Write a structure and sequence with these properties.
binds geranylgeranyl diphosphate, 2 strands, carotenoid biosynthesis, (2E,6E)-farnesyl diphosphate synthase activity
Length: 276
């Protein structure tokens, strides 16, 4: 439950602190840490860890990979927040990177977090993991985040007959800007933990489903307290869609070890039933 996530999130925080220490050049490291070590919920690295354990791995095996996906998540925010893109002065209720360090330092801090993600995944992953698996991890991670994946979502996310193309655009953006990196987290965990190719594909589909589910539920909450699921399919159909995503995510975990699969089932039904 929230306890599993809170506790794994805490171990991730400590790992991130350790992975990117303050050293020379100091400013750049401060700027990287400012953003990396802020208050993310850490869902991506925790899903990574969870996926590793689901397949019989241990948290320690996946921890470098988990840190990499969070570094990549962090760098995406840093760049998205720049004036030339979303122009966010605030995120997490705090000044954004470029507001504290300048746009220049913010771009560089994102660049160094992207590259270090790969350095860390490649260099810090235990030698018990077969290098073929680490190569695959590198490739999955890069693919998930470039032009087929995340960046595609960002270039599309610009704001048309919404009745002809609105739903298609909405699913596209969410699949690309949310599901893609959650898919990479789960896939990297499965890969690094020794999962079969079948197991990896079930984890990929699970992650896609809970990625869409997060956004559908967020939209329902927003109206029961921009283009949205309630606007484009109505609220009832939005609720039916979230329930079908919850079911589908659960169905993907059919066939895994009964005890091992609880934290993922708990995460699906938690995301699904968010009250706040
Ligand atoms: C990765 C490469 C190659 C370039 C980055 C391309 C960019 C700038 C993409 C846009 C990234 C973006 C704004 C993605 C949305 C991510 C998202 C779902 C953010 C909110 O997620 P939470 O998990 O709630 O955030 P916390 O970390 O605060 O928990």
């Amino acid at each position: 439950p929230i306890s599993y996530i809170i506790r794994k999130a805490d171990s991730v925080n400590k790992a991130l602190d350790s992975a990117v220490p303050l050293r020379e050049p100091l400013k750049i490291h401060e700027a990287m840490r400012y953003s990396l070590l802020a208050g993310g919920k850490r869902v991506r690295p925790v899903l990574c860890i969870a996926a590793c354990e689901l397949v019989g791995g241990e948290e320690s095996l996946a921890m470098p990979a988990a840190c990499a996906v969070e570094m990549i998540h962090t760098m995406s925010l840093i760049h998205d927040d720049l004036p030339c893109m979303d122009n966010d002065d605030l995120r997490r209720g705090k000044p954004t990177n470029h507001k504290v360090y300048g746009e220049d330092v913010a771009v560089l801090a994102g660049d160094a977090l992207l590259s270090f993600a790969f350095e860390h995944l490649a260099s810090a992953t235990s030698s018990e993991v077969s290098p073929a698996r680490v190569v695959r991890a590198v490739g999955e991670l890069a693919k998930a985040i470039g032009t087929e994946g995340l960046v595609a979502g960002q270039v599309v996310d610009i704001s048309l007959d919404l009745n002809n193309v609105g739903l298609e655009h909405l699913k596209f953006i969410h699949l690309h800007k949310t599901a893609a990196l959650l898919e990479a987290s789960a896939v990297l965990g499965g890969i690094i933990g020794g999962g079969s190719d079948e197991e990896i594909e079930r984890l990929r589909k699970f992650a896609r489903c809970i990625g869409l589910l997060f956004q559908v539920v967020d939209d329902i909450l927003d109206v029961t307290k921009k283009l949205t699921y309630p606007k484009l399919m109505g609220l009832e159909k939005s609720r039916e869609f979230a329930e079908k995503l919850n079911t589908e995510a659960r169905d993907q975990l059919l066939g895994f070890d009964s005890d091992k699969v609880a934290p993922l089932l708990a995460l699906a039904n938690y995301i699904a039933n968010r009250q706040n």
